[PDB]
Design a protein around this ligand. Structure first.
Ligand SMILES: CC(C)(C)Sc1c(CC(C)(C)C(=O)O)n(Cc2ccc(Cl)cc2)c2ccc(OCc3ccc4ccccc4n3)cc12
Ligand SMILES: CC(C)(C)Sc1c(CC(C)(C)C(=O)O)n(Cc2ccc(Cl)cc2)c2ccc(OCc3ccc4ccccc4n3)cc12
Ligand SMILES: CC(C)(C)Sc1c(CC(C)(C)C(=O)O)n(Cc2ccc(Cl)cc2)c2ccc(OCc3ccc4ccccc4n3)cc12
Lengths: 148, 149, 139
C-alpha cells in the first residue's frame, strides 16, 4: 500500500476498525442472552432480555452498511478528516442507542433509526465532492490560455 | 482524491449514494409502522402492516451488501459504466419489490430474492475482468518479435 | 483499472466474489423453506426447518459486513495474501456454521458468533499496517 495514500485513509480505517470492534461487542451481548437459557440450538426468542438485545443488535446491523457507505464516500469524495470524525460520533450514538435499547420497561429507544443527522451530513460531503468534481471537470478544464 | 480517479468511480458513487438514500427510505416506512402500532419499545412483531414492512425492509438489508459487492467489483474490475447502470436498475427492482411487499398482499409478491439477474450479471463483469486480467498478466506481455534473429 | 493495482487486490476480489456467491446460496436455501411452507411475512417463530434456516442465514448476513471490513483493511493495510487466505477460511467456517445450523433434530449449532479468530486475526493485520504506517511516517 502506497504510504502516501494510506495516509489519506488511515482515519476512516481507524474509525472503521473501531466500529468493527464495537460491532463484535453488540454481537457478544447477544451471545450472553442466547446463553442464559435454552439458546442451546440458538432459539431466536429467549425473552425480554434476549429479545431486547437481538433486537437492538439487529437494528445496528442494518445501519452498518448504509453508514459505512457515506463514511467513505464522504471520506474520499471529500475531506478524510470531517468524514472520519462524524463517522466517530456515529460510533457514539450507536453505543448510546444500543445501550438504551437494553430494556427494563419504558420506551427503550423505540427507534429502528438513529443518528439520521450524522449519515445525512456524511451524505452531504459525498454529494458535495461528487458535484464539486463535475465543476473541476468542466469550467475546471476549458480555461484556455491561447498565449500564441 | 485524485481528480482523474474520482472520475472513473463517480458513477458507482452516485448509484451508491442513491441506494444509500433509498435505503433510508425503507428504514423510514418501517418507523411509520412501529409508530402507529402504538409500541413502547419495538419488537419485530405486532400487526400485518408493520410485520409486512419490517419484513420487506429486512429482506433488502440482506441484499445491500451482496449487491454492493458486485456493483463495485464489476465497476473496477470492468467498465464503470455498465456496472453503474446495472446497479441503477437494481435500485429500481428494490423499489418495485419493497413496494409490492405489503401493499397488495396478493400471492405473486412474497419472496427473499429480487434481481438475481442483475447481481448475476454484475458478478459476470467482475468475474470478467478478474480473468481477463490474468491474461494481460500472462499473455499481454507476449510478442514473439524477439525471434528477430 | 490500472493493471498493476488490480494485481494487488485480485485476491480479495476473488475471495469476495466467492463469498458473494456463497451468500446467494444461503439466500437460496431460505427460498426453499419459504416455498415448501408458504409465507409473506417471516417474522414469527415458524416452521422449524424454515425457522432454522432463516435464522442461520440472518446470522451470516450480520457477519458479512464486519468481516468484509477487516478482509480489506487487513488486505490493503497489510499483505494482500494472508488477508485473502484468512478471508478464504472464513468462507469455510461460514459454510460449516450455516450447515450445522440446519441438520434436523440433531443439536443444530447455537451461537451466531463465529470464526471469532479469523476476523480477530484479519483485524490484527489491519491494526498492524495501520500502526506500522505511523512509523514510516515518523521514522
Ligand atoms: C477485533 C476483535 C473484536 C478483538 S475479534 C472478535 C472478538 C474479540 C474478543 C477477543 C473475542 C473479545 O473482545 O471478546 N469478539 C468478541 C468480542 C468482540 C468485541 C467485544 Cl466488545 C466483546 C467480545 C468477536 C465476536 C465475534 C466476531 O465475529 C464476527 C461477527 C460475526 C457475526 C456478527 C453478527 C452480528 C454482529 C457482529 C458480528 N460479528 C469476532 C470477534
Ligand atoms: C439523504 C439521507 C442520507 C437519506 S439523510 C436521511 C433522511 C432524510 C430526511 C427525510 C430529511 C430526514 O432525516 O428526516 N432520513 C429520513 C429519510 C431517509 C430516506 C427517506 Cl426516503 C425518507 C426519510 C434518514 C433516515 C435514516 C438515515 O440513516 C440512518 C439509518 C439507520 C439504519 C438503517 C437501516 C436500514 C436502512 C436505512 C437505515 N438508515 C438517514 C436519513
Ligand atoms: C450472482 C449469482 C450469485 C452467481 S446468481 C445467484 C444464485 C445462483 C443461482 C440460483 C444458481 C442462479 O442465480 O441461477 N443464487 C442462488 C444460489 C446461490 C448459490 C448456489 Cl450454489 C445456487 C443458487 C442467488 C441468490 C441471490 C442472488 O441475488 C443476490 C442476493 C439477493 C439477496 C440476498 C439476501 C441474502 C443473501 C444473499 C443475497 N443475494 C443471486 C443469485
Amino acid at each position: 500500500m502506497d504510504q502516501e495514500t494510506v495516509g489519506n485513509v488511515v482515519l476512516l480505517a481507524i474509525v472503521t476498525l473501531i466500529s468493527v470492534v464495537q460491532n463484535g461487542f453488540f454481537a457478544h451481548k447477544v451471545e450472553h442472552e442466547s446463553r442464559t437459557q435454552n439458546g442451546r440450538s440458538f432459539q431466536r426468542t429467549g425473552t425480554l432480555a434476549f429479545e431486547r438485545v437481538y433486537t437492538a443488535n439487529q437494528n445496528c446491523v442494518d445501519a452498518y452498511p448504509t453508514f459505512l457507505a457515506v463514511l467513505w464516500s464522504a471520506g474520499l469524495l471529500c475531506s478524510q478528516v470531517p468524514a472520519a470524525f462524524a463517522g466517530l460520533m456515529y460510533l457514539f450514538v450507536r453505543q448510546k442507542y444500543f445501550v438504551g435499547y437494553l430494556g427494563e420497561r419504558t420506551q427503550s429507544t423505540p427507534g429502528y433509526i438513529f443518528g439520521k443527522r450524522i449519515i445525512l451530513f456524511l451524505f452531504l460531503m459525498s454529494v458535495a465532492g461528487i458535484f464539486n468534481y463535475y465543476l473541476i471537470f468542466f469550467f475546471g478544464s476549458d480555461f484556455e490560455n491561447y498565449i500564441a
